[PDB]
């Protein structure tokens, strides 16, 4: 329950589907009137390169924008998440 | 002007000293009452690794948690950035 939570929910499990993300590490999304804006931290593998990194970011990006049309604005980035890693999302 | 915007450009400042750090991309810095919650995207040497990214951002995070006190929470994470971007950072 809380409809944010679905909403924010949404907003990990699509980026997830992404390949290369290992998980979210955090995701903070607010309200401005019906639109979101919200910044995210993908994990990914800690021996890709930087540049691979941003490509993640951006495939993060276009599929989450894509499918969650209230958001009017979306900032991925990245840190390195290993693999035994089962730390669950942190938002709010 | 702007104590607020004084206030972020000591975080872009205090960052841009960390070495490994090619600019600030973006921040966005809140109160909850004195003190200050605050997401930041350093950009990265491409060609590094995302370990060590990693600790570029671990290296920023004490830094700037250590110069500026009222910072509560900041969350640093990375990003590609090429050596002829001068972007300025984006706040808000
Ligand atoms: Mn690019
Ligand atoms: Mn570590």
């Known amino acids: 329950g809380s409809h944010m ?12 589907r992404v390949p290369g993300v290992r998980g979210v590490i955090h995701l903070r999304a607010r309200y401005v009137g019906q639109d979101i ?9 800690p021996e890709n390169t930087v540049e691979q990194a941003h490509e993640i970011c951006e495939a993060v990006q276009a599929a989450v924008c894509g499918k969650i049309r209230r958001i009017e604005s979306l900032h991925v980035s990245a840190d390195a998440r290993e693999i035994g890693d089962t730390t669950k999302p942190s938002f709010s």
């Open 37 to 45: 804006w919200a910044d995210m931290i993908i994990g990914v593998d």
């Open 5 to 16: 939570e679905a909403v924010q929910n949404r907003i990990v499990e699509a980026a997830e």
